[PDB]
Structure formats: C-alpha cells, structure tokens
Amino acid sequence: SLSDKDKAAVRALWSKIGKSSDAIGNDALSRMIVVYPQTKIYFSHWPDVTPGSPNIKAHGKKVMGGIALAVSKIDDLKTGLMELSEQHAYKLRVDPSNFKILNHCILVVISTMFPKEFTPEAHVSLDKFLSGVALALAERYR
Amino acid sequence: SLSDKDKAAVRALWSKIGKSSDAIGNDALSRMIVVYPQTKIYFSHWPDVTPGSPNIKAHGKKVMGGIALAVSKIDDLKTGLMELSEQHAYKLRVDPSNFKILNHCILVVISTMFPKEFTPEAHVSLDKFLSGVALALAERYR
Amino acid sequence: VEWTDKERSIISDIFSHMDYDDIGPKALSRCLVVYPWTQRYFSGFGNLYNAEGIMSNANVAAHGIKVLHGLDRGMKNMDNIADAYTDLSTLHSEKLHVDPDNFKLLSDCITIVLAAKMGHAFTAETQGAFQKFLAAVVSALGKQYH
Amino acid sequence: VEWTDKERSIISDIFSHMDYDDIGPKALSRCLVVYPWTQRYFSGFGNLYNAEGIMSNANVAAHGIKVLHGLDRGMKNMDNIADAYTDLSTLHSEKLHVDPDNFKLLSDCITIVLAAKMGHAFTAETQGAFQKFLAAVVSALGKQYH
Ligand code: HEM
Ligand code: HEM
Ligand code: HEM
Ligand code: HEM
C-alpha cells in the first residue's frame, strides 16, 4: 500500500506531467498494441488499430483520464475505480496480465518524455501506485 | 479483497482441516523444498533439509501457525501480518515470487488430505485469501 | 530437458493410471471457476452462468479431455517436447492469443485435481517429476512468439 | 527466434549507439531501488543503505556494465541466443538461484533507462524489436532448469 510519501510523490509527479496526458495516453496505448500484439484483440472492433489512428488517440485520452481519477482517489483505489473494474474485469473480461503490460508502457512513455523528472525515487512510488491500480481494477473478477 | 462469503468459507474450511495443520505444514514445506529447489537456500543453515527432517517438521508447525493467525485476522491482513512481513520482506529479504510457491504447495497438500472438502467453491476463496496473505507479507519490501 | 530414468517411470506410471474422463473435465472446470477471466477465451461454450453450470457443462468436459490428450502426446515424446507442440503452440499463442501466464494456471489446476485423486500416492518426488513435465509442456506452448 | 532484417538493423543500431558506462549502472541501480528484494542476491557489494548509496556505489556500477556486456554477446549471435547463454543460464539458475521473474524486472529497467536516453528516437517499432531481443535473452537465462 502507499505511504504518505508515495502519495505526495505521485501527486507532485502527476502535477508536473499531467499537461501532456493526452499525448501520454495515445503513445502508451500505441506501444502496447505494437509491442504486445496479443492485446490487439480487445480493440479489433475499431477500423484502424495502428499508432496514427484516430481511435487510439481518443481512447488514450480516456485512459489517462482514468489515471487522473486514480490520482485524485489515491486514498481508496478499490472504491474509486469500482466502475472501471466492473467494465473491464466483468463485462470485457480483460485478462489481468494485460494491466501490467499497459502500466509498463506508461512508464516507458513517461521516461521518454520526462527523463529528468522520472527519477528512481519517483519510479518506485509510481510503480507501487500503478500496481495499486491494477489491483483495484482486478477487484470484480472473482 | 475478500467478501463476507469468502471469509465464511475460509473459516469453515479451516474449521474442518485445522486439526491436521501440523502435518499440513510439514508436508507443504517438504514439497516446496523438493519440487522447487531454488527455495532451499533460505534454509541452508539447517543441518537436515530433506522431507523427513526434524527441522522441517518444527518449522511447518510455525508456518501453519502464521496461517491460523491470518484466518483470525482475516478482516485486516495488512496489520495482522505486519510483524511477519517485517521478518521476511525486510530482514530475510525472501523474494516474493516464493510466497506464491508455498501457497500452491499448501493447496496441493490440502487437496491431498481433504479432497471431499476441497471443492472448487472452497478453492476460489482459499486462493483469494492466500493471495491476500502473500500481499500482506510483501507490505514491508518497499 | 534432461530426464532421468526415475522421472520417465514416474511420469509413465501417472499417465497410465489416469482416467482422462475424470481428470480433464474437473481440471478445466476448476480453472474456469477459480480464474474466471479464462472463460473469455472460450467462444461458443453455452450457459456458463454460475459454478454448477460450468461443472456439468458437457462442452467444458469434452474440452477437458482434449487437454489431457494433448499432454499425452508430450509424455510419449519426452526428448522432443518442444517440437511436438508447434501446432498447439501456434494456435494458442497466435490464433487464440492466450496469455502465457494462463497455461501456468491450468497446469496448476491439473496438479491440484490429480493430487486429490491420487491422495498420499502423490508424493513430493511424484509431484517433482510431474511438475518438471508440465513446465516443459508450458514452455513448449508459449515457445512460438516473444 | 525468427528475426527480420529490419529487426537486425534496429537492434544493431541501438547497441552501436549505447554508452555502456551510462546505461548499465543506471539500469541496475534503478532495479535495486524499485525492486529491493533483488539486492539480496548480491553478496558482497558494500554499503547499500538508502537510494543515493546504491546510485553512486561503484560496485553496482561495475556490475551494471557486466550486464550490458552480457547482452552484447547475444546481439552478436542472434540465431543462436539460446546456446551462447548456457554459461550464464547455469550460474544464474543453479549457482545463484535467482528466480526467473527477476530477469524480467531488470530487463524492464534497462528498457526504461534506454527510453530516457533515446527520447523520441525510442519509437514503438524500436521498442518492439528491443523487447523481442530481451525476451529471447530472458528466455535463454532461465532455460536451464524447470
Ligand atoms: C491502466 C489501466 C487501464 C485504465 C486506467 C483503463 C481505463 C479505461 C477507460 C477510462 C475506459 C473507457 C470506459 C468507457 O468508455 O465506459 C476503458 C475502456 C476500455 N478498456 Fe481500459 N483501462 C486500462 C487497462 C486496459 C487494458 C490493459 C485493456 C486490454 C488490453 C483494456 C481494454 C479496454 C477496452 C477494450 C475498452 C473499451 C473501448 C471500446 O469499447 O472502444 N483496458 N479503459
Ligand atoms: C504462507 C506464507 C508464509 C508464512 C505464513 C510464513 C510464516 C513464517 C513464520 C511464522 C516464521 C517464524 C518466524 C520466527 O520464528 O520469528 C517464518 C520464518 C521463516 N520463513 Fe516463512 N512464511 C511464509 C513464506 C515463506 C517463504 C515462501 C519462504 C522462503 C522460501 C520463507 C522463509 C522463512 C525463513 C527462512 C524463516 C526463518 C526460519 C529459520 O530461521 O530457521 N517463508 N515464516
Ligand atoms: C496448458 C496446457 C494446455 C494444453 C495441453 C492445451 C491443449 C489444447 C488442445 C489439445 C486443444 C484442442 C483443439 C483442437 O483439437 O484443435 C485446445 C484447444 C483450446 N485451448 Fe488449450 N491447452 C492448454 C491450455 C490452455 C489455456 C490455459 C487456455 C486459456 C483459455 C486454452 C485455450 C484453448 C482454446 C481457446 C482452445 C480452442 C477450442 C476451440 O477450438 O473452440 N488452452 N487446447
Ligand atoms: C536479465 C539479464 C541479465 C544478464 C544478461 C546478466 C548477466 C550477468 C553477467 C554478464 C554477470 C557477470 C559475472 C561473471 O563474469 O561471472 C552476472 C553476474 C551476476 N548476476 Fe546477472 N544478469 C542478468 C540478470 C540478473 C538478475 C535479474 C539478477 C538478480 C539478482 C542477477 C544476479 C547476478 C549475480 C548474483 C551475479 C554474480 C556476481 C558475483 O559473482 O558476485 N543477474 N550477470
């Protein structure tokens, strides 16, 4: 679980990078689909599922919006993300191994954009937070 | 996280098998050391680290005692197992991949001893509970 | 994999005494219940409702038997597990897109169901040989794409 | 692994422009900080205190460079990754007893440090080739025992 120190480092980081969250979400989602092709089946209903794609761009905005929600609900992730856990883990039955993949790609994308701010200290807390997200999303499976 | 249904099924199961917990702990620990040899380095300081072993027997009693503690503290695993998380994850730096291994071997051992009571319904809740344990034990690493 | 002659005999005894009609359906059933996101990969299976739907669903049973029969082939060819599984490895990790982590879950359910059938006969050393076998099979199922 | 000629060129460009003295120490440092149980496997390393101990510990640096040089050998022999790693696979998964899951953690830290160095040049397709490479290396490091 996160410490008040972890919470503060996530808020301060998000404070620094959240301006570019639209580009972060597009980029992180593009990379998950290219580097981890097994994930493309969840978006097979879109006409264009390649990095340029208008659909990836619109949906990455939405995913970074869910992260922004987890940041503001950082003290109770389980309740804050219950609607989203319902959607993924109940309806779409997204296989949870895939949440670690998207989380990895978000870290790569932040590293790519904010190398100076993405220090190892910021990385431990962002990594605990992102695993808290994955865990909150996995709540409704069973 | 566990539901009141999960909690009740764990208590009822533990109620049925807890008589034989000394044999469950010896057996589960014997199997982890034989089937998953990478785990033997944490007990290299014992003179005998083979299934018969007097040391495995005494220590399996202790591990099943930690499980009995998690059952009685089932509503807040994080706080109930904090001393043990300190011991493993801080002091011994046990690598957390190993908690899933010991948990698997406990399920095999219960299945071996109480096939009738180890139904699939009992298995989902016992499996959520054992992962809650592993997660509570991993609390102090970082 | 380098196999011992003791391992060959254990693995052969195990398979030779297994009832595929009993183990396969229970292993798969249980996997679909304990790890319910795995139900997603099975398109056309029917009324997969609750836990007693799955348990007596004849389609899940049918399919549990095909899984044990797929293991039967690696048992018969232990020095060449990797290549006897190219067909299956290709379907599972390129036509079905099943995450590798799941072969590991099912394999854990086959072990648990086999431990409840064999009881005390399912010793640590027996478990150690069967586990080495299945880790080889699991390894051969993902082998295709990285 | 079946490699494309585009993959061969990407992987070769990457390595050819990497500063091993910069990447290796930062990747390993970061791995020891983000996943601190990995510090356990490193017997004799010294004062591994806090985060700025680890970051400027010359022994961790020294060792970060050996890891990148160990990758350098698989890059030079891509059609035979598996067998160029028997020495290392044997030390890591039988003399050191390092859980396979950890090669995956370090490999993720090398990617993150390499993404911060290359910036926008570290494209999805670049990432896709490097990841395929490292999954092959990780596969070759555990390959020894099941
Ligand atoms: C960081 C973890 C994730 C977050 C924060 C997240 C967030 C979201 C949000 C906010 C939505 C929109 C919900 C709506 O429109 O009602 C969504 C939809 C969706 N998510 Fe995720 N998600 C995550 C992980 C994943 C993963 C790993 C996958 C699959 C590989 C996935 C697959 C989907 C799909 C298929 C949709 C529906 C889009 C459509 O129907 O066009 N999600 N997600
Ligand atoms: C279900 C998960 C586990 C539980 C409930 C558990 C419980 C315990 C308990 C109650 C003790 C005794 C503490 C004391 O004597 O102060 C202990 C000690 C220990 N545990 Fe665990 N443990 C678990 C998992 C593991 C794993 C997976 C490993 C390593 C592979 C491990 C390694 C050790 C060691 C090395 C000791 C010290 C024994 C000695 O010094 O002789 N534990 N554990
Ligand atoms: C780990 C050991 C496994 C083995 C030996 C195995 C083997 C098989 C075999 C023999 C078939 C029969 C299909 C045919 O004759 O074309 C099959 C089908 C299938 N298996 Fe597996 N499998 C394994 C694990 C898994 C897992 C973990 C999943 C996850 C969902 C899975 C999903 C499927 C699917 C979706 C099919 C296709 C059935 C259809 O055609 O509708 N398998 N597998
Ligand atoms: C994943 C990619 C990895 C590669 C290519 C790699 C490669 C190497 C190399 C080249 C050495 C030099 C030793 C010698 O010359 O004898 C080494 C040593 C070592 N590595 Fe790794 N390694 C990797 C991952 C890991 C991980 C994840 C761990 C976890 C702790 C680890 C633990 C060690 C240890 C304990 C040593 C021995 C140093 C000593 O002798 O004190 N390695 N490795």
Overview in brief:
By secondary structure, chain A is mainly alpha-helical.
Secondary-structure map with pairings?
The complex is a heterotetramer, with two copies of chain A (142 residues) and two copies of chain C (146 residues).
Chain A: H1 4-17, H2 21-35, H3 54-72, H4 77-80, H5 82-91, H6 97-113, H7 120-137
Chain C: H1 5-17, H2 20-34, H3 51-56, H4 58-75, H5 81-84, H6 86-92, H7 101-118, H8 124-142
The complex binds protoporphyrin IX containing FE (4 copies).
Family (chains A, B): Belongs to the globin family.
Binding site for heme b (chains A, B): 88
Binding site for O2 (chains A, B): 59
Span between termini of chain A: 21 Å
Q: Structural class of the secondary elements of chain C?
A: mainly alpha
State the assembly state of the protein chains: heterotetramer
Taking all Cα atoms into account, the compactness measure Rg of chain A is 15 Å
Order of secondary-structure elements of chain C = HHHHHHHH
The helix fraction of chain C, in percent, is 55-70%
Q: How many domain regions of chain C?
A: 1
- In total, the number of strands of chain A is 0
Question: Helicity level of chain A, as a percent range?
Answer: 55-70%
How many domains is the backbone of chain A divided into? Answer: 1
Shape of chain A: globular
- What structural class results from the helix and strand content of chain A? mainly alpha
Share in β-strands of chain C = under 5%
By CATH reckoning, the class of chain A would read Mainly Alpha
How many DSSP-defined strands of chain C?
Answer: 0
Question: Biggest β-sheet of chain A, characterized?
Answer: none
The CATH topology annotation of chain A reads as Globin-like
Task: Tell the overall outline of chain C.
Answer: globular
Please report the number of helical segments of chain C: 8
Distance between the termini of chain C: 21 Å
Q: Might you state the CATH topology name of chain C?
A: Globin-like
Binding site for O2 (chains A, B): 59
Domain Globin (chains A, B): 1-142
Keywords (chains A, B): Acetylation, Heme, Iron, Metal-binding, Oxygen transport, Transport
GO molecular function (chains A, B): haptoglobin binding; heme binding; iron ion binding; organic acid binding; oxygen binding; oxygen carrier activity; peroxidase activity
